[PDB]
């Protein structure tokens, strides 16, 4: 093996998995590691374009290698929690509010 003298092209066989839809996972699309849902994209790419971005420098749309289709990325729904409560001298019950 010859190392640290040239660009590397003899890479190992990296395996591939099956499709997934509408359920956010820790995907890895050709080295692009991220977390977010996988939905059908209404956008239209160009044949030399791999993955998209936006204003906020975040990944929004990715193209799988196994298909000429493109899959959008939207992060899993995060949100703070709040506790509606009266005084504990009055009652012990609470109400949960999701923001």
């Amino acid at each position: 093996f010859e190392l640290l003298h040239a660009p590397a092209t003899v890479c190992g066989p990296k395996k591939s998995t099956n499709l997934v839809k509408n359920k956010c996972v820790n995907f890895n699309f050709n080295g692009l590691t991220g977390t977010g849902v996988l939905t059908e994209s209404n956008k239209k790419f160009l044949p030399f374009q791999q993955f998209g971005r936006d204003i906020a420098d975040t990944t929004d749309a990715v193209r799988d290698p196994q298909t000429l289709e493109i899959l959008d990325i939207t992060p899993c729904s995060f949100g703070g929690v709040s506790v509606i409560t009266p005084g504990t001298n009055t009652s012990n019950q609470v109400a949960v509010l999701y923001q």
């Binding site: 906020a56 975040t58 992060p75 995060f78 949100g79 703070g80 923001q99």
Partner: peptide
Amino acid sequence: SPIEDLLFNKVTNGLTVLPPL
């Protein structure tokens, strides 16, 4: 009011924006 309508029409991760009360 029409003036309020005109004024409203003219005026145009992990970070969360709360709604006003």
